[PDB]
Scaffold this active site. Structure first.
Site, mmCIF file in Angstrom:
data_model
loop_
_atom_site.group_PDB
_atom_site.id
_atom_site.type_symbol
_atom_site.label_atom_id
_atom_site.label_comp_id
_atom_site.label_asym_id
_atom_site.label_seq_id
_atom_site.Cartn_x
_atom_site.Cartn_y
_atom_site.Cartn_z
ATOM 1 N N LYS C 41 1.724 -40.694 97.475
ATOM 2 C CA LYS C 41 2.671 -40.098 96.535
ATOM 3 C C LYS C 41 2.319 -38.651 96.200
ATOM 4 O O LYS C 41 3.142 -37.929 95.649
ATOM 5 C CB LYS C 41 2.776 -40.900 95.235
ATOM 6 C CG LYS C 41 3.247 -42.342 95.391
ATOM 7 C CD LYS C 41 4.498 -42.475 96.241
ATOM 8 C CE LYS C 41 5.290 -43.667 95.854
ATOM 9 N NZ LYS C 41 4.488 -44.884 95.974
ATOM 10 N N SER C 271 -0.985 -52.747 99.035
ATOM 11 C CA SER C 271 0.184 -52.485 99.864
ATOM 12 C C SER C 271 -0.241 -52.307 101.318
ATOM 13 O O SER C 271 0.479 -52.724 102.203
ATOM 14 C CB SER C 271 1.016 -51.315 99.370
ATOM 15 O OG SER C 271 0.422 -50.078 99.752
#
Ligand SMILES: [Cl-]
Ligand SMILES: [Cl-]
Lengths: 7, 308, 308, 7
Positions: C41, C271
């Protein structure tokens, strides 16, 4: 028992 | 441009210019968090394992020992797992559950030692399993292993030269094993031939290098600058290539790490705060006004407790 | 080769070949932990701030809002600090002290919300300060902001092309906002013109994409694959460039993350375990036997609690 | 109150 020896 | 394993993926870490430190942007940081395992020790971690292989003191069937459960413990653990070796780490029972679970997450055969004992309850313990089969166990010894500074001389140092187009004037690094400043310094002064200034950083609380250099009594003490200040002269610190020694207290280190996060947007560890603070001190001397100063940030926040 | 601030230092993250997954080394990972802030991110975090500047919806005097206290919250926080903006993050009071202290370490003006409320006690809250001065606050909205996939199309995707010498056949990525697979996919298929296979990954527990694609009833549910499985179709997931959808449960994800650490020496988040597990499934189909599969590992362990 | 929305 040196603490700051654990690098 | 694909790596055969995570160990090969070390280095090419970035240089960021600091905005609220130094003078007209003369203080540039090297971000050592951007490595597998997330510490400067990834480099040595790979290469001490590579080296022991290359010279054949490591082989399929030999299992690795040490008592470092610090950045070098994580470094070795990642490399061992990448490369099929089982690792045993000594460590007093006094340690944190989260490093005990970071390492047991990494597949370390952790060997809980003694909270009556510390790093002797460790150092001496590791040896005993090295003892109980010295063709089985093999112990790498980051404090005296040449493959430690060698890697720095062949990666860390050159990357700085290249990124800076040979402009770097000063290099600032905290000392645990000494391998960073030693390798870096040898690369730039010896392989390139530029006469820069090498600044070792040590805690004011345990200032054994300055004490040695000044022919005073060596007097180690407690501090909180985790990763530096071993309390002795490491055989991996080449005292010869060291031009300058700066001391820094735990509070300042600690505060400089908070500032880095909050002002620079740089996720610095505690040692990283120490090294910056000392670079800033030099940086604001007219004598280093027009001088490009590179600082090693060894580790990332989040591994830490600079968050009080 | 020095960066003006930490935001400019995004990307060029490494490709490592997996040894205990796939077939004859066909499964290669991209390590997104090797970024400032330490998550995928960081990329969007930089560029959504860059973009709002470039088009002038952001300026010295405007302060940023959102309620993400996930990887995008950390991304924005680092960038805000690097670049002189003060950030407010909404977040229910239900959250962890260590993210509350990671962010308050990063200089976030945290705005504790409601443990009777969750992400509505947040999402709607952020808006209200956006409301109470809509020339003051500005909210970036990672789920619909084009600067999200744009960055991936201009960095993440090309880096893969280049590292692989245009060999990449398949790309596997978990979906939160969808920006990774969308940008990556557009780069490789549109800017380069190679007809690869784009696999979105979602939790079996909350499989809203497959459900949509199959013209079934959309039925979100709880899972533990933090960072993916929003429970809706993000406007940033371009459903058009998506060739395949793989589902993965929390246990497998969780186990695949442990395996990555302990077997590959790769410090994977939860993830990351999800995305690998699905890549492996494809990887062991004769149909993808001779196919180079690239997997996004969005985040690093240590931010986590895959350590039970 | 969507938990997995905090990405
Ligand atoms: Cl030499
Ligand atoms: Cl398009």
């Amino acid at each position: 028992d040196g603490m700051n020896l654990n690098i | 441009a694909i790596y055969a394993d995570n160990s090969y993926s070390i280095g090419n870490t970035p240089l960021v210019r600091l905005k609220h430190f130094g003078h007209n942007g003369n203080v540039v940081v090297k971000i050592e968090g951007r490595n597998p395992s997330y510490s400067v020790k990834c480099r040595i971690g790979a290469n001490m394992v590579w080296q022991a292989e290359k010279d054949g003191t490591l082989t399929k069937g030999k299992e690795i020992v040490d008592a470092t459960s610090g950045n070098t413990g994580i470094a070795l653990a990642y490399v061992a797992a990448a490369r099929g070796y089982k690792l045993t780490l000594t460590m007093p029972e006094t340690m944190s559950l989260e490093r005990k679970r970071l390492l047991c997450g990494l597949g370390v055969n952790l060997v809980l030692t003694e909270g009556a004992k510390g790093m002797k309850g460790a150092i001496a313990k590791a040896e005993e399993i090295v003892a109980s089969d010295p063709s089985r166990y093999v112990m790498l010894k980051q404090f005296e292993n040449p493959a430690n500074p060698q890697i720095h001389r062949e990666t860390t140092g050159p990357e700085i030269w290249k990124d800076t187009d040979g402009k770097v004037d000063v290099v600032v690094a905290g000392v645990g094993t000494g391998g960073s400043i030693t390798g870096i310094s040898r690369a730039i002064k010896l392989d390139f031939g530029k006469q820069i200034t090498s600044v070792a950083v040590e805690p004011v609380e345990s200032p054994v290098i300055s004490q040695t250099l000044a022919g005073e009594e060596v007097k180690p003490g407690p501090h909180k600058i985790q990763g530096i200040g071993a309390g002795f002269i490491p055989k991996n610190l080449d005292l010869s290539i060291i031009d300058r020694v700066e001391t820094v207290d735990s509070d300042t280190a600690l505060a400089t790490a908070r500032r880095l996060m909050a002002e620079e947007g740089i996720l610095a560890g505690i040692s990283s705060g120490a090294a910056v603070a000392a670079a800033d001190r030099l940086a604001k001397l007219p004598e280093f006004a027009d001088k490009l100063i590179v600082v090693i940030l060894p580790s990332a926040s989040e591994r830490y407790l600079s968050t009080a």
